[PDB]
Swiss-Prot record:
Cofactor list: Mg(2+)
Segments forming domain Protein kinase: 6-258
SMART domains: S_TKc
Record lineage: Eukaryota, Metazoa, Chordata, Craniata, Vertebrata
CDD domains: STKc_PIM1
The organism of origin for this protein: Homo sapiens (Human)
Protein name, per record: Serine/threonine-protein kinase pim-1
Amino acid sequence: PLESQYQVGPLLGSGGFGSVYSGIRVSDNLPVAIKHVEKDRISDWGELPNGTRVPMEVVLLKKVSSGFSGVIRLLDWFERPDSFVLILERPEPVQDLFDFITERGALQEELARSFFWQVLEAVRHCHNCGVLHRDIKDENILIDLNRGELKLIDFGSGALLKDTVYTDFDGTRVYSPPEWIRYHRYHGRSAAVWSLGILLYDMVCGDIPFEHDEEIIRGQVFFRQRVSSECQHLIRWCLALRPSDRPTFEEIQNHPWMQDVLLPQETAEIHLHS
């Protein structure tokens, strides 16, 4: 074992998530992402079923890794004196949703429907596993371009799912709900639905709807692109000011705009040119 198991390629990126390198597993040529997180830079810690002290990110990733391909899976992890190394799966070719939107602008509704539906299934999987991502946004969504499959990344600001109030939030501000801005308090599910509202607007308009605190609190949504009445309704419902007025995941998926979604492979053939 140790670090004989992987061949380290080029740097893919770095930021609040750490430093991530392209990699290959020598056991079977499998593409992987090798993410290094410094110990002195993590605030949230937890324990694994085995009973070890690891970054919360690892706890959460282990809980959501398995069968479902809607989340980038943790294949293994290692501990070093000053850091933790995470071996994640690496689809290829791939592009994150932020870059995808920057390049193509506002997405056609058929495409946004397929993408949004997949994000919903991924978030449901997380929540079923007892995990709350807390930073759902375009930058944290990877598109497997050949299969048309979306994958959720970066659980570094996540938390165990609970039914009581959360008083901490280290996720992206502009995707944060009015109740966090005004009271420094939110519940998991309704805060997640707010972020999904921001994400859907972003997909169909090419940018997020709110820039400033005052705009988030006012909750008035202006559309900069042509968007169907049904899509506008769903977005406005997800962005309801009162947490209890937002839809549940089931209500989102049963909404008229969400019906007749394309399959991932279909989405890729029609829109990603597979």
